[PDB]
Design a protein around this ligand. Structure first.
Ligand code: NAG
Ligand code: NAG
Ligand code: MAN
Ligand code: MAN
Ligand code: MAN
Ligand code: MAN
Ligand code: MAN
Ligand code: MAN
Ligand code: CA
Ligand code: CA
Ligand code: CA
Ligand code: CA
Ligand code: CA
Ligand code: CA
Ligand code: CA
Ligand code: CA
Ligand code: CA
Ligand code: CA
Ligand code: CA
Ligand code: CA
Ligand code: CA
Ligand code: CA
Ligand code: CA
Ligand code: CA
Ligand code: CA
Ligand code: CA
Lengths: 417, 417
């Protein structure tokens, strides 16, 4: 056993060692004895010049093609001489040379990371492989200086495995749709060789945003007895998420009043609220409708808006007349100033639509006077004469100030005693 | 017009006012003239005693049953006397009394709020209604002193509407499944009346938790050529979410080596990895398998574990013999120590499974000697005699140290010159 040592990938004709002398042989002895050198399994990697007895590198010695991922590598040369036939053994180690760079399976990698992913959670990032063995194979990793993600180098200790790509900062798809990272790797053996990777990460859309109405409060005015289907309002809502997490369906809140839910209808898609049932100002002066906009995600989110509608009074109620008192038949002796009947007037409407004025036929001695708001007394004006006219027919007309106006009458047969 | 003023719900016989004197009438004048008092639309709410000329409360005067939600309330009494017939008008206002408490539509309310709901977002909380009007109707709200939610009282200003139930602290379904709030409301008018509500809020399950393996690293040892289907490992993963967000499907990572993906199979449900293809120690010493556990939510989350398996070498390779040199035919003159053939031995296995010893038939003059590791030279021992035996048959047996062991032979016909 005689041991030599050379680095791989050596230049053609590299001095391995004077094999003749080291085997105790002499120069004039080499040629006649047919000094031969053979390899075990490889081939013509090493050759011997007989004139100087020098063992040298014959062909390209690629270490990784021989031992591969093995730590120890050595070419075994058997040496044969004849007359007499002697056999010697020389083993020459092949030291590793850092002539291969750290390579990744993919130069660019599309990663898909969810927006809902918790912090302090790492994603399996592929590591680079190296053909070399030893310090030349010791890999050092480096992440691009970005704020969203951090890197954690693997350790030898058990219960901890995998190249670390750790979350420490929150992520939002709407703010930044894609993040581009760069992973650089350098071996430990000099000269240094590098490897780069362009990680293209597209953050997935999570349903973490609720729909939002342009106006948080809508105020519309609606007349009375407007036909069903009349466009009350048109609402618009928006949502930052995409897909079914972005599409919005409209509805009335579950806390809505039954009468309100029966008086109005809302298009789930259009968001336009229209009149459904009869609307009376004298029944309800206004309505306060809560509107819910809800997306179509797995876990639905809801936004809300308040739509208050003030009903507007129209003159649609005919005035009411009522004789509350009577003093009939009236004596002929009755002086000027006596009261015959007390009149009461009402109007269900409001404002000028409910402001009623009263009049009467002028062919009657009696007079009409306002004693109080919406109250009249039919007072005898001028004198009478029983035999001339023993009877009268007092028609009283009540008329509101609406535009247009409604009117009602009330007659009374006034007999004279 | 003569005006009086009384609080509602007055005791029977409550002094409203001396109506006779205030109308300028006299006591002895009331009875003969049939002093009468009537209401406009209500009825026998007020009555007059003629002996003292006193107007008083006759029956129960419930304000809210009269004017309702109206601000102004007043009973209109028309007064009639006869001989001569005169008509007077007295209006008596009915002031509001805080005799009705703030009432909610529901004493207890099941609210359903998502775990994914953003902060600073309020949920529509129903308000209480009150029959009274004025300061007695001014409502003050109060939320139970809880940490998760806060309350925001409604304002008169537009663009701001709805009873505020504001999120300011994060919410987690797994930590606290339900939160119970208490809403208390007090009117502004004295005496104070209250209203309580038990809000039962059940936070909905969001898919915000990734599955987690009990062990982040599994290390198993597997022999060689073990039949396909052999249980390599059994992995367990857990997840805090419920439903389809909790169920976990197992698989091999997308970055797995093709050979590894073809050599092993993993049950998506059971999580048990078994042998699929042939496994050779001489081809691959070990495997590093990344295992992904992914839930079945709308936005899937994935946990990962590393399962490394070290293959164990078995003695399944028969030793190799090789005659690398020959000096036949051997001269009879050849002395003791001459070399006939050089022998080389190999074994693809490792350890004692690859430790080969050599022997030979003892009925042969020649000798076997170790020159180097796995190398033998067939050296002539003792002397010869051409005419006696002109030929030989040297059988050499190589045998590894495995348990059990494998062996191979190599014979050579040694002719003597
Ligand atoms: C609603 O969405 C946005 C406003 O947020 C606007 O661009 C769009 O035109 C609106 N659609 C309608 C129908 O008004
Ligand atoms: C896996 O889930 C838990 C451990 O996290 C355990 O209670 C359960 O029994 C395990 N199941 C199996 C089949 O090992
Ligand atoms: C009021 O008076 C008119 C005329 O007399 C009637 O036609 C009407 O029906 C109401 O009685
Ligand atoms: C008004 O109408 C009534 C009938 O409703 C008559 O009786 C009265 O004389 C006046 O014409
Ligand atoms: C008023 O009207 C009535 C209607 O019949 C008469 O009967 C009465 O005499 C007076 O003319
Ligand atoms: C080694 O030698 C044995 C005995 O001669 C043979 O049977 C075998 O095939 C191998 O050649
Ligand atoms: C071993 O076997 C060979 C044939 O393979 C013979 O030629 C030899 O003589 C020895 O018997
Ligand atoms: C070794 O074996 C061979 C087998 O044929 C013979 O031919 C030779 O003479 C010697 O005996
Ligand atoms: Ca190389
Ligand atoms: Ca190398
Ligand atoms: Ca290298
Ligand atoms: Ca989103
Ligand atoms: Ca978002
Ligand atoms: Ca959404
Ligand atoms: Ca009306
Ligand atoms: Ca009217
Ligand atoms: Ca009206
Ligand atoms: Ca009351
Ligand atoms: Ca009251
Ligand atoms: Ca009250
Ligand atoms: Ca959850
Ligand atoms: Ca959770
Ligand atoms: Ca989950
Ligand atoms: Ca094997
Ligand atoms: Ca073996
Ligand atoms: Ca083996």
């Amino acid at each position: 056993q005689i041991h030599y040592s050379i680095p791989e990938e050596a230049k053609h004709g590299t001095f391995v060692g004077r094999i003749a002398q080291d085997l105790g042989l002499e120069l004039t002895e080499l040629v006649p004895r047919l000094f031969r050198v053979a390899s075990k399994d490889r081939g013509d990697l090493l050759e011997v010049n007989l004139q100087n007895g020098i063992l040298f590198v014959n062909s390209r010695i690629d270490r990784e093609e021989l031992c591969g991922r093995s730590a120890e590598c050595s070419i075994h040369l058997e040496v044969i001489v004849d007359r007499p036939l002697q056999v010697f053994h020389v083993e020459v180690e092949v030291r590793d040379i850092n002539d291969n760079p750290p390579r990744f399976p993919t130069t660019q990698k599309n990663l898909f990371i969810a927006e809902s992913r918790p912090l302090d959670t790492w994603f399996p990032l592929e590591g680079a492989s190296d053909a070399d063995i030893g310090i030349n194979a010791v890999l050092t990793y480096r992440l691009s200086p970005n704020d969203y993600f951090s890197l954690e180098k693997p350790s030898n200790d058990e219960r901890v495995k995998g190249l670390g790509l750790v979350l420490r900062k929150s992520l939002d798809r709407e703010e930044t749709p894609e993040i581009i990272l760069v992973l650089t790797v350098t071996d430990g053996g000099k000269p240094e060789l590098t490897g780069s990777v362009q990680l293209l990460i597209t953050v997935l859309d999570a349903n973490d945003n609720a729909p939002v109405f342009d106006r948080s409060l809508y105020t519309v005015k609606l007349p009375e007895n407007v036909p069903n289907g009349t466009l009350v309002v048109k609402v618009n809502a928006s949502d930052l998420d995409e897909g079914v997490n972005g599409d919005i369906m409209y509805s009335f809140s579950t806390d809505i009043s039954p009468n309100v839910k029966y008086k109005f209808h809302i298009d789930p898609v259009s968001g336009e609220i229209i009149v459904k049932g009869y609307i009376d100002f004298e029944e309800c002066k206004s309505y306060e409708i809560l509107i819910e906009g809800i997306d179509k995600g797995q876990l639905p989110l809801s936004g809300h808006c308040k739509v208050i509608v003030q009903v507007e009074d129209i003159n649609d109620n005919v005035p009411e007349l009522e004789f509350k008192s009577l003093s009939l038949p009236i004596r002929e002796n009755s002086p000027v100033g006596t009261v015959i009947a007390l009149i009461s007037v009402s109007d269900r409407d409001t404002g000028v639509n409910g402001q009623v004025t009263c009049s009467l036929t002028s062919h009657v001695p009696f007079k009409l006077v306002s004693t109080f708001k919406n109250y009249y007394s039919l007072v005898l004006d001028s004198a009478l004469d029983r035999e001339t006219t023993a009877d009268y027919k007092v028609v009283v007309t009540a008329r509101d100030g609406g535009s247009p106006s409604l009117w009602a009458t009330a007659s009374v047969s006034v007999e004279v005693a």
